[PDB]
Structures are given as C-alpha cells and as structure tokens.
C-alpha cells in the first residue's frame, strides 16, 4: 500500500534528496523561480537583470532552452574523485554545490574560454568550407 501526494514537488523540498531524484522536478523549480511603487520598481529591474544574467550564460554555453545540457568540458577528478553513482545516487544538491563551490568560476571559465571559443571558431571554418 502506498500513499501519494498530488502531482509534484511543491517548492525546493527535493534540495535535500539525492540529485538524481531531485532532477525530476527541474521543470517545476525553474518555472517557479524564473517567473512603494519605486521600491518595487527597483526590485523589478533587479529581477530582470538576474533573469537575463542566467540567460546570457545559458545562451553562450549552448544550453539555452534546456534545463539539462551536456557540455564538452572533461571533469577534472581533482575537483572530486567520486564516481557517477557515488554522487548522483548518494548526494543532495545542497551538499554537492558546497563540495565544488570553489570550482564554480573555474569550470564556468573553462566552458567559455575553451569550448565556446572552439565551437565558434570551428563553426565558421566549417561553414566556409
């Protein structure tokens, strides 16, 4: 016998479950987050800038339109030597982000400086010839 909730994750609750299980509701969480007068006016502009900031990076990385996209940057096991299953079936999003917090800027840089650079250079060369 199994008791069930209604439809899907309410809000953020999956943050403490494994990243594997949590991935199920990225569509939910993303939609919810993505979407006196002067103070609110300021807040609105800030919300837009935060919104567009993320969209800029997703655009550049070739990830726009996706909530899950594979890159072409290899994982340097110096960051973490855990296997695929040792991470995804054993660690939460809150825990994972902390584990590699100090590599965020490194990897983000690598995506753009190496892969994006390559994809744009080679793209033109392929279109030319």
């Amino acid at each position, epitope marked *: *016998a*199994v*008791g*069930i*909730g*209604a*439809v*899907f*994750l309410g809000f953020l*609750g*999956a943050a403490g*479950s*494994t990243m594997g*299980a*949590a991935s*199920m*509701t990225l569509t*939910v969480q993303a939609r919810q987050l993505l979407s006196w007068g002067i103070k609110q006016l300021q807040a609105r502009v800030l919300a837009v800038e935060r919104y567009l900031k993320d969209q800029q990076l997703l655009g550049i990385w070739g990830c726009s339109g996706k909530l899950i996209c594979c890159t072409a940057v290899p994982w340097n096991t110096s960051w973490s030597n855990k296997s695929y299953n040792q991470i995804w079936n054993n660690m939460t999003w809150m825990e994972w982000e902390r584990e590699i917090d100090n590599y965020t800027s490194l990897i983000y840089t690598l995506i753009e400086d190496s892969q994006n650079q390559q994809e744009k250079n080679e793209q033109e060369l392929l279109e030319l010839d």
Partner: antibody
Amino acid sequence: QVQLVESGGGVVQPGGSLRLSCAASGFAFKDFGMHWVRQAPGKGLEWVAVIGGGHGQHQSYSESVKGRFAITRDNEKNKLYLHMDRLRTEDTAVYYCAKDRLGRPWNIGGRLVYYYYGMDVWGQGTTVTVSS
Amino acid sequence: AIRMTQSPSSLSASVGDRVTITCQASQDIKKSLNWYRQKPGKAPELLIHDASILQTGVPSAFTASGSGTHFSFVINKLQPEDVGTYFCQEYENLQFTFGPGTKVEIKR
C-alpha cells in the same frame, strides 16, 4: 532498546473524548511511519489508521473511525497521538501504536509517496472504555 | 483492501502434528500478506511477511506460501508454546485489513 510506552487510556462516557499518547524510543521515530490498531474484547484486530514518516504528509483512516478520530505526531517528543473524539460505546477497545516496516516519503515520479508494508513493531496498548 | 477469509475458525491438533491455516482473498492481492500470532496478554507477533519470508529472529518453525487469492500458513510442528490466534492481514491498499484470525490449540 525499542520500547513503546502507551498510555492516556481510562474510562470515558459516550460523547466524551480523550487523547492517547504513545511515547517511543530505540528507533528513528521521526523517520518511520506509524500505525494505529485496536482490538475490542472478543474480537480480532481492527486497523484504525496510518500516518507517514517525516512530518506525516499523508494519512488514511478506516471507514469505521473516519471523521471521529485524528492522527498526529510530535517528532521532538517522540510521541504518537490519537485524538479520540465524540466517542461511542462501540469504540471500546485496547488501542495499540505500531511502526510500519517502512513508511518513508520517497521522492519518486516528482512527488513524495509513502511506502507501507505493514506493522512490525508495537507495544501492548492501553484499554479505552466507552460506557455509561 | 480486499476482504480476507480464514478457515477453520477453530483448529486443533496434538503436540508435534503439522497444522495449517487456510486463508483466501476474494480478489487478487498478488503477495501483500503478513502472518501474525497472538498469545493471551500479548500483541500479535509478526512471524511471516510478504507471504513467505520469516521475520528476523523468528525460528524456522513456520512456513507460508501461495499467491494471488490462495494462501496458507504452515506450523511445522504444533507445540504448546505455539498456541495462539494467527491472523492473515492484507496490506495492498491503505486499509491494511485483518482477517478473522484462526485459533490454534492443543487437543485434550
């Protein structure tokens, strides 16, 4: 070790009320789902209700008790409660608290669900008499 | 949960005999069956779960089998210590219905 201390019973009149409180230790009370069952004198064991683990985001009641009883829990006191309201003489029974084999809020299909496989841990209950 | 029935309501044998309890569902419950044993003054003891697997710490004095609608509980040898009421519980749906219970005792 595992021990359930089940009290709060006694004798009440029909139309009255009481609340039972089953204190427990020796296990992760906060995590496992729990059961209520009762056995009237001369009868077999009747299932009363179930509450899931964690904060108890799901319940089910026997049709014989729905609307008259409520289940809750306090994960810091490690106590399981049965709110026995608007009682009838038919509610005379020894009531037991029990732990399900699992009862956990699994994240599956994008939602939490509680998997139950039946009671496997309990105390000896306490007698609640409703009479006049 | 599907209503369970047990038979005979009164089952007895001499000490050491092989004693079985019939239990059936009116509808297919596939496997969701627990066996409990109640002794006077004690809450029912879980002996077998998932229709065939002994609970940890329970001696191999009992077996059970069947699936679908037809199940049985087997007492390999009935000892005075095994006297009690055995219950057939279904937990397929969130009603966890108990069967009537069968009383097993020693002939005299």
